[PDB]
Structure formats: structure tokens, C-alpha cells
């Protein structure tokens, strides 16, 4: 019993099922303080007593299943946004539980819910924008292109050599 409890209590699956059970009140919101509360939480979440888990053979067949069965067919895009978030969470739990149980007709529903969650993630990323600004060039109507970069230009040869072909030596300072 101790080894079984230590193994399952450290399974993230158990914690996720326990959270789902806590949401609708099947188990107390506080973690167990006494062994009786732990046994009750195990019975509610896993669905089988630890003594009877060792006697039979399945494990995933009777894990908690949320009480409220909302309609996930409104996840077809169709007080609406928080309800959509609740539907996303509940369908994620239901699909994860189906994945554990190797339920038939699973990959197509997984892809459909992945598309739904991608749309929900687009909305959430819309909620997560600090903003953006572009310093517009007043002469134009868009991002500034003016720069102080170097621009090549073929200067006249008179700047380097005088009328007698000798190079210039600018070495006399004229002060006014």
C-alpha cells in the first residue's frame, strides 16, 4: 500500500485528476492532513481502493471523470469567453483521459481540439500585447528611413591636387 501510494501520488496524472476533482468539489480543496483523507482522495480520484487496485488489473479505466459535461460542440467557435476557457480546460482533461485509455476515434478529435486551442491561443496572444510604435517620417507616411550613414561621392580631383599636380598639405591655420 505504501509503495503504491508513493508511486501514484508522484504521478502528474494523479495530481491533474485530483485538480479536476477539486474543481467540482468531489474532494476537499485542501490536501489531506490524515491518512483517512488521503484514502478518500485516492478512492475518489483513482476510483479504486489501493487494496483492490492490487487485486485486479486495470488502472486507467476508472479515473475521475468530471462531473459537469459541458457541450464541447460550441468549441466549434460558436459570458461567452470565460465559458470558452472552461470548455477548453474540460475538453483538455477529457482528451487526456481518452489518450490514457487508448479510446477509439482519438487522433481526429485530438487534431480538432488542437485547432480549437490554437485559435484560443491566438486570442490569448491578443490579450498579451504591450503595444508597438513606429517613428514615422513626416515627409512620408511610414517608418523613418532617414539615416546619418556614409554615402559615397566622387569628389573632384582638385581637392587632392593643385593646378601643378602636387598634393595638398593643409597645414596653415587661418584665424579671424
Amino acid at each position: 500500500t505504501k509503495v503504491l501510494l508513493t508511486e501514484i501520488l508522484l504521478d502528474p496524472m494523479y495530481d491533474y485528476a485530483a485538480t479536476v476533482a477539486r474543481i467540482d468539489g468531489s474532494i476537499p480543496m485542501h490536501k489531506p492532513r490524515t491518512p483517512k483523507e488521503a484514502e478518500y482522495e485516492f478512492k475518489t480520484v483513482i476510483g479504486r481502493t489501493p487494496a483492490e487496485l492490487l487485486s485486479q488489473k486495470e488502472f486507467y479505466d476508472k479515473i475521475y471523470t468530471s462531473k459537469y459535461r459541458p457541450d464541447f460542440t460550441q468549441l466549434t467557435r460558436l459570458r461567452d469567453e470565460e465559458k470558452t476557457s472552461t470548455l477548453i480546460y474540460l475538453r483538455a482533461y477529457e482528451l487526456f483521459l481518452k489518450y490514457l485509455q487508448n479510446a477509439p476515434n482519438f487522433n481526429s478529435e485530438l487534431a480538432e481540439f488542437k485547432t480549437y486551442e490554437n485559435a484560443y491561443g491566438e486570442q490569448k496572444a491578443l490579450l498579451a500585447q504591450q503595444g508597438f510604435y513606429n517613428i514615422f517620417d513626416p515627409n512620408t507616411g511610414r517608418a523613418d528611413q532617414r539615416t546619418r550613414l556614409f554615402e559615397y561621392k566622387r569628389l573632384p580631383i582638385s581637392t587632392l591636387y593643385d593646378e601643378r599636380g602636387l598634393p595638398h598639405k593643409w597645414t596653415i591655420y587661418v584665424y579671424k
Partner: protein, 80 residues
């Protein structure tokens, strides 16, 4: 993980107008977003999203530090 209760620099009570500043800002972005995917907002190269008047209407003064921390602080709820 949220907008700080007070400005990190001087300690003005930024937090008491934080939540509102969040939500309102969103609609303003929705007004200026424009035919563009949300995650591509910081790459639009044509946006002029200015939040000066919103923060002014919130009553927050024109302090550099306070508006900096109000605008730039990331929210953990929006990434997790």
C-alpha cells in the same frame, strides 16, 4: 508576475490602477490592431499605438519611471 503594486523607482501606487490599465489597453489595441494576427503586432511596422492619454486619464502623473513600469511589466497570466 504582475504589474507591481508600487513603482520600483519611487513607490507611487501604480498597482491600484494596474488592472484597469491592462484591460482598457486591450480594447485600444483592438481599435488600432488592423487586419493583423495578434502575435505579429510587434512586427507590423505601421502601428502608432500610444498610451499617453490612457495613463493620463487613469490619473497617474507624467513620471518616466511610473509609466515605464506600468507599460513594460510582463504578466505571468498571459504567458502561462
Amino acid at each position: 508576475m504582475l504589474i507591481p503594486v508600487v513603482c520600483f523607482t519611487c513607490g507611487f501606487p501604480i498597482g491600484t490602477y494596474a488592472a484597469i490599465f491592462d484591460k482598457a489597453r486591450t480594447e485600444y489595441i483592438k481599435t488600432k490592431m488592423g487586419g493583423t494576427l495578434p502575435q505579429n503586432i510587434p512586427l507590423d511596422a505601421s502601428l502608432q499605438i500610444e498610451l499617453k492619454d490612457l495613463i493620463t486619464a487613469l490619473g497617474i502623473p507624467m513620471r518616466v519611471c511610473c509609466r515605464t513600469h506600468l507599460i513594460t511589466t510582463l504578466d505571468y497570466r498571459k504567458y502561462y
